[PDB]
Design a protein around this ligand. Structure first.
Ligand code: T7X
Ligand code: PSF
Ligand code: ZN
Lengths: 268, 30, 233, 214, 244
């Protein structure tokens, strides 16, 4: 009513005074600080004339920049800080894959060696923690080492785990079941059955791991207020007072992680 | 965007203003 | 100067007081949007009088984090995710070079283990992806490998290709027009003429692609997405 | 093969909110102590915990969706680092990555389910695997990649692509690690004062909203 | 055993009222001069046993309990010498002990956020939170009776009152119990500045009310000797108001 209008007016006066005082304070600094702008980053954007073909079931991190003509399959996800810089040739990404944090996948400009082929990514394959992909042609059911630098012409087949930190050189093809690693190609060991099962289990598990990140990074601000209020409200419990009041404080359904991301299943 | 619409918080704000004015008057009048 | 620092701190105090007054007024009116979790990132972070200088035609990525007093020339690209950072000393970037994706330039932020060496970047210098050039001076017309790990005291003279994944050690000089790779870096071979020509064309091609990105990078921010994210259910 | 991709009309492009540096997973809210400098580019997810005096520089993607991430007092994780933890480790010990006091980790440190003791400076392009135990007072040269399960004896600095003993350490060289940690802490303290709490970016958003509709 | 806020309320709020009650009873209802003997021996025993027992404790709350017992003996010194100066010293000691106990329990509640139990958990606290370490060291010294702090003034004037009545044995026992009492206080100091344990316990930051109270009490303790006139005048007026 009238009191509400008066309080709105005095709030507007206070806001204007605060803006003027903030401007004066910034002026006193000598304009040596760069003021913050809203957002110049786009999570995925066209390069010349074509937009990426991202599937509906894909988790793309807002930090990640999947630019240009990049095709992403079902269930596959892009993690934080990962750059899919595809500007000259398509980047076909399989289904259920995961290009992990700080990872780069880039395509040569069709003439790095003369017969350049586009960077093709298989399905059910993992890249792993900021690896380097430049013209690679990874197929299904493979593991790439952490920080690996698979260069142009590298054709890694199925069950072709690459040791972390490897530097596979130009036009190198690894047979299935090898653990080639080190700064050179430098074959180390053979992929055992249990290690293959471990690779498959990791590839399958990160698929259901990405769903919580998808449902969290996409939350609206109004949902975030409720989420923070609930999280702070139920941070700690007290059996004494709750029992005395005859009530039990259960965690809200919005505060329940799915059982598939637990350390192995702890419903209780 | 003309009225606060929260008739409960408004009473708190006016009470705080009255408290500040009363404190100032107490300091000056006494 | 100390006199400038006092003014800067008083500016902090007055600015935060103004923002607090604005928050009190906004909250008193019955609206809470200051509580938002907007990513408070700037691509041109500055400290005291160390504000960065970027040429008008230079391309800087939105995700690029240029911190300090980095000088950037005309036509050189500042690509996605690069962490150009000069605080204890300046970072010199020439004209027409290309700091590629997921790179970073150190200045040895600490003080121990000797003085800090500024980083010089020449013209038409091709910097590979995942570069961690660490207080090393590199002049024009050279190539840096894919994932090289150059340390301080490294002077790479003209046409000095570096192999991918090299671990060039401290106080190591790379002679002209030759590759230097391995762990640790070891001499591989001599650079041929066609590779020098490839070096020459690569900088121009990457720069052209950089302005191709930059022309459409300053576009209006597609207000339809902004309207969509507001009405999210 | 499938070769089938379904575009979505509700796809998110140009999130105006940016990134939401702090990403909670239910109860797993990333706790960060005050006087811990965390750059805006840093992505914190899961149950990552950063203690006081620590510092995290831009590009780090610390996520503890599997196991909690611990950063000790006056311990800095440099820029573009990637850390993680696994459900299980080959060594049999709990697979959680913990960084104790006075540890410099260095840029492009690929930590995952490791265990770092105090005064264990780490060089750049370090590719620490799961189950590794870098015992107290050790130095790891740039580019070092140690295989899972391998441990670094105290007072010994290692380098090269694999875990390779290089040379021993003296007291004078050993004592400089805490000095380096506190120097990085001082630099992070200088950087922390640059940005105040509660950034005024919301004014730009409100102006943009007022410019079209409401 | 009792919860930390309860023990904070105890040993300050009850003791003040009970001591005022004992003053009222002692001044009026006691004219046979027979309570001098019962206060004498009991205060001496409190002094000696508090000083000799607080040095053997490894927890914090037990140490505060025995420090409280020792300070109760120090205050009870004033009952044996029945004069205006004796009651003045008693009341001044009660006031200073109340302030120091509030500050010490604010310290204990501050570290209660991470469940501090023993005395060794507060190791290397000068690194994680140097300023809280300084505050705790100052409060501990004030307990000890070091000159350039409050707490020394109370012990000083209690000794003056004891010597005024000719109870020369009270002064000597007070001096010796103070000498032993300072020893384990400095022992608390060493584990909290000098020696650094292998494992460090991290304490989450405090809240504003406790911090403000702690800062006020710390500035009172250090700067008390600069301007102690108001307390002395209050106490002299209070001691005389028992009769007129
Ligand atoms: C060159 C510059 C020269 C200098 C220019 C001089 C300018 C003069 C400026 C004076 C500013 C006065 C500042 C006094 C500040 C007092 C504290 C602010 C109190 C305050 O939270 O706000 C109201 C509450 O209301 C009152 O609880 C009690 C209300 C107390 C505050 C009412 C003050 C209204 C006075 C209006 C005077 C108009 C003066 C007009 C000035 C403009 C003229 C042009 C909003 O509560 P709320 O539920 O939405 O939210 C609160 C709040 O977020 C936090 O306290 C808690 O975190 C949260 O739990 C919750 O409690
Ligand atoms: C003249 C400036 C008045 C500014 C008044 C003001 O900002 O109140 C909030 C502050 C801090 O309280 P919050 O943690 O809820 O800040 C909430 C959040 N940081 C916010 O900004 O809203 O109150 C005080 O300490 C001041 C007590 C003495 C008040 C005189
Ligand atoms: Zn490239």
């Amino acid at each position: 009513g009238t009191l509400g209008r008066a309080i709105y007016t005095v709030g507007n006066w206070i806001r204007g005074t605060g803006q003027a005082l903030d401007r004066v304070g910034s002026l006193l600094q000598g304009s040596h600080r760069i003021e913050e702008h809203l957002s110049r980053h786009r999570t995925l954007m066209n390069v010349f004339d074509k937009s990426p073909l991202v599937d509906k079931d894909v988790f793309v991190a807002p930090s990640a920049s999947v630019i240009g003509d990049v095709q992403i399959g079902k269930g596959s996800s892009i993690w934080y800080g990962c750059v899919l810089r595809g500007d000259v040739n398509n980047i076909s990404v399989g289904s259920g894959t995961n290009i992990q944090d700080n990872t780069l996948v880039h395509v040569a400009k069709t003439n790095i060696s003369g017969k350049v082929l586009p960077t093709l990514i298989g399905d059910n394959v993992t890249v792993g923690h900021s690896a380097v992909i430049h013209g690679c042609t990874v197929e299904d059911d493979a593991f790439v080492g952490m920080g690996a630098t698979l260069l142009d012409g590298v054709v890694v087949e199925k069950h072709a785990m690459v040791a972390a930190g490897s530097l596979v050189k130009q036009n190198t093809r690894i047979p299935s079941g090898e653990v080639w690693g080190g700064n050179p190609a430098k074959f180390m060991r053979k992929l055992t059955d249990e290690e293959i099962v471990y690779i498959s289990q990791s590839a399958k598990n990160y698929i259901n791991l990405a769903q919580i990140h998808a449902s969290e990074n996409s939350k609206s601000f109004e949902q975030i207020e409720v989420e923070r209020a609930l999280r702070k409200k139920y941070a700690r419990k007290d059996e004494d007072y709750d029992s005395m009041l005859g009530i039990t404080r259960e965690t809200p359904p919005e505060l329940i992680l799915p059982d598939n991301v637990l350390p192995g299943g702890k419903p209780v | 965007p003309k009225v606060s619409e929260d008739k409960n918080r408004n009473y708190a704000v006016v009470a705080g203003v009255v408290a500040i004015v009363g404190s100032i008057g107490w300091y000056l009048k006494a | 100067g100390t006199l400038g620092r006092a003014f800067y701190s008083v500016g902090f105090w007055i600015r935060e007081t103004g923002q607090a007054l604005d928050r009190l007024g906004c909250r008193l009116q019955g609206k809470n949007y200051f509580r938002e979790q907007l990513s408070r990132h700037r691509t041109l972070m500055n400290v005291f009088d160390k504000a960065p200088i970027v040429d008008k035609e230079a391309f800087v990525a939105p995700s690029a984090s240029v911190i300090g007093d980095v000088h950037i020339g005309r036509g050189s690209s500042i690509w996605y995710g690069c962490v150009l950072r000069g605080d204890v000393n300046t970072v010199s970037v020439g004209s027409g070079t290309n700091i590629q994706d997921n790179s970073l330039v150190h200045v040895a932020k600490s003080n121990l283990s000797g003085k800090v060496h500024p980083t010089i970047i020449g013209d038409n210098v091709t910097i590979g992806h995942s570069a961690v050039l660490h207080g090393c001076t590199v002049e024009d017309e050279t190539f840096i490998g894919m994932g090289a790990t150059l340390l301080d005291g490294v002077v790479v003279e003209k046409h000095g290709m570096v192999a991918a994944g090299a671990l060039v050690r401290q106080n190591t000089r790379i002679p002209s027009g030759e590759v230097w790779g391995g762990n640790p870096a070891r001499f591989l071979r001599k650079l041929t003429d066609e590779e020098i020509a490839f070096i020459s064309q690569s900088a121009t091609n990457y720069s052209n692609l950089a302005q191709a990105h930059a022309a459409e990078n300053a576009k209006p921010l597609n207000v339809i997405e902004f309207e969509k994210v507001l009405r999210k259910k | 093969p499938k070769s089938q991709v379904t575009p979505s009309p509700d796809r998110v492009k140009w999130d105006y909110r940016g990134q939401r540096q702090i990403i909670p997973l239910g109860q797993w809210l990333p706790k960060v102590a005050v006087d811990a400098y965390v750059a805006p580019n840093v992505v914190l997810a899961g149950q990552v915990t950063v203690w006081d005096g620590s510092s995290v520089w831009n590009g780090a993607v610390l996520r503890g969706d599997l196991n909690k991430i611990t950063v000790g007092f006056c311990s800095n994780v440099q820029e573009r680092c990637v850390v993680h933890a696994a459900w299980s480790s080959p060594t049999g010990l709990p697979a959680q990555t913990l960084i104790d006091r006075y540890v410099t980790v260095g840029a492009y440190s690929l930590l995952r389910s490791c265990t770092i003791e105090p005064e264990c400076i780490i060089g750049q392009h370090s590719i620490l695997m799961e189950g590794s135990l870098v015992e107290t007072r050790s130095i790891l040269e740039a580019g070092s990649v140690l295989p899972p399960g391998r441990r670094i004896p105290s007072g010994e600095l290692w380098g090269g692509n694999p875990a390779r003993f290089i040379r021993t350490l003296t007291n004078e060289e050993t004592l400089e690690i805490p000095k380096l940690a506190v120097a990085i802490n001082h630099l992070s303290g200088d950087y922390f004062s640059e940005f105040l709490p509660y950034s005024t970016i919301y004014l730009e958003v409100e102006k943009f909203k007022k410019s079209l509709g409401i | 055993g009792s919860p930390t806020p309860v023990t904070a309320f105890l040993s300050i709020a009850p003791k003040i009222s009970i001591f005022a009650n004992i003053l009222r009873v002692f001044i009026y209802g006691s004219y046979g001069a027979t309570l001098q003997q019962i206060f004498f021996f009991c205060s001496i025993a409190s002094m000696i046993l508090g000083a000799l027992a607080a040095m053997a404790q490894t927890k914090v709350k037990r140490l505060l309990a025995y420090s409280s017992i020792g300070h109760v003996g120090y205050i009870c010194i004033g009952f044996s010498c029945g004069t205006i100066e004796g009651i003045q010293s008693l009341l001044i000691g009660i006031f200073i002990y109340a302030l120091m106990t509030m500050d010490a329990f604010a310290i204990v509640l501050a570290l209660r956020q991470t469940r501090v139990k023993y005395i060794a958990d507060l190791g290397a606290l000068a690194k994680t939170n140097p300023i809280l370490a300084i505050t705790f060291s100052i409060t501990m010294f004030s307990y000890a009776g070091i000159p350039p702090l409050a707490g020394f003034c109370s012990k000083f004037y209690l000794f003056f009152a004891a010597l005024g009545c000719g109870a020369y044995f009270l002064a000597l026992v007070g001096v010796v119990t103070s000498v032993i009492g300072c020893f384990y206080y400095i022992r608390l100091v060493k584990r909290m500045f000098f020696d650094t344990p292998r494992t460090w316990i991290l304490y989450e930051p405090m809240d504003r009310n406790k911090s403000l109270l702690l800062a006020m009490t710390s500035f009172f303790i250090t700067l008390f000797l600069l301007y102690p006139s108001p307390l002395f005048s209050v106490t002299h007026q209070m001691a005389l108001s028992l009769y007129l």
